Amino acid sequence: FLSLDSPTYVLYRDRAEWADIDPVPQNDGPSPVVQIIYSEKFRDVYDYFRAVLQRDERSERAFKLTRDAIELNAANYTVWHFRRVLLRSLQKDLQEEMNYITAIIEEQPKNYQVWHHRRVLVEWLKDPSQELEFIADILNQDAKNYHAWQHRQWVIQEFRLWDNELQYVDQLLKEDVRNNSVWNQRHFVISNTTGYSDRAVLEREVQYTLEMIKLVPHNESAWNYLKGILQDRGLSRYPNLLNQLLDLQPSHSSPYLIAFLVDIYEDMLENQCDNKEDILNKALELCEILAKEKDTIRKEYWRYIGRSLQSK
Template sequence: MGDSSSDEENHWVFYRDRPEWKDVEPVPQDDGDVGVVSIRYTDKFKDVYDYFRAVLKSSEKSDRALELTKDAAALNPANYTVWQYRRDILKTLSKDLHEELEYSRCIIEENPKNYQVWHHRRVLVEWLKDASKELYLTELILSQDAKNYHAWQHRQWAIKTFNLFDGELNFVDQLLQDDIRNNSAWNQRYFVINNTTGFTEEVLKQEIEYTLDKIRIAKENESAWNFLRGLLLHDKGGLSKNKMVTEFCEELYASGNRSPFLLALLVDMCDEQVSLGGGDSKYTLERAQELCKVLSTEYDKIRAKYWEHMASVIQKKADGTYEPTAHNSSFSADES
């Protein structure tokens, strides 16, 4: 914690040595009884936070206090109290929030995985009722780390709150062209469709075609398989009645492909048909048992116990002795 740069500390003018702060009595950190390991704060860190605690105690809201919060945030950008107090000062002094947006952008670029900084920016956008810069900012951060959770969370919030869905599927498609296994991008695709057109029959057809094309490129891509299963949960025919999907899966299986994601979907199709009392000779109890066996012994050994359990569950469904509980499918739509 604190600033480890000795050169910067050498040029640092301590608050206790600044004439304009002579009227303030610093408030030292109270760590209580010293434990086994005490925190070694730098002199600069102690100086800044001693004065920050002082202005907090006196509720001073001034330009100098605002500048102090900037120093405090630079030393510990994860400190909630610093950011909250900074917002209080901004409001009290009626500061230019567009300038604060620019400041927050700089801090986010330096600390792209810091929740408090992202939260600060979200509040500013809410105050301004202006999210015009949020897609660009998140795109910039995602170009450095395409799976940054905070950037995705902020982007989804901005898109949904300010109705910025136009062009988002094109953005997602570009991300998937860059990295077909980007689970965050697949999740964003689901988010956009779910909040715009919904999973109509026409949209389902388009998205299933899109996803199958991606699976053809990378047949072991778990993200695409999860997305496909999420789509099928919206198909009124269920998992095993979409001809486009069943033909694709059967052709892939016949070609010798034994991806655990393909086999898992076939197990779910069998499970569905057995639960409904049969009706499709391709998806039977016998096939489910065979698939569960090869998954547990060859293609997905790490989850052998799960596949043994699934075989038992499907057998009980066939026998009519199964008592339903919370059934978690092998790959849920939430993961897509």
């Protein structure tokens, strides 16, 4: 009905339909702590909602009342719930509600309730027909929206909408390879569909990554990700790699590369290898070029590493 931000919009306490209802004020107490000086509009819409909630009036004037009390604070759960209760009891059209949530989320895609509401409706209407695309709409306004990627994961898992995701993560990655969200969504698809055990794909991701890792040698994303997969099995299972990296020392260097090398010498020592003193020498070396000059911000970390290898 009356949009809460319309020039015409009028306080409830001045509305007819809301003449039989007595709005109930907030009960902060004799001595109020952290009391908020609510504006008139806000304090109106809620003291009234209090009443409706109070007499669990499953009315329609109320269902409307929640659209407002929600716009005044879309992070108020107690209210999102009563709304859910009204959508059901009032037998309301969930597609209409889809449109509502869609919009209101565009207004605040960094809110927990707006998104939880979306999920529910999709669980009620058992239909994700419009998920992976409205979510891309949001991720188009902010590629790193934590909630957007969370909703997207769910949507994909529940209804098994895999497939075209890599064709999505591949898009955005080219869109900005520094995005860590897409790199996560990447490990998500694969690991959950084709997995990584499959030598081919891995062998494949490995390359692809490396290119980035050698296309933007200072992107800690492609770096954390490359170690992301080879890491489980042992960074020391893959001989080649090392040199294949050492083969960048001059070419493409960064604390990431050197740190990778230190990471490898750490496995190349766990599975009792040969040249301890050369690893447990060239490895302690690095923690130093890192902890002393290259990556000094985490000086106490690096110094710790080289201090660990010593004992064990």
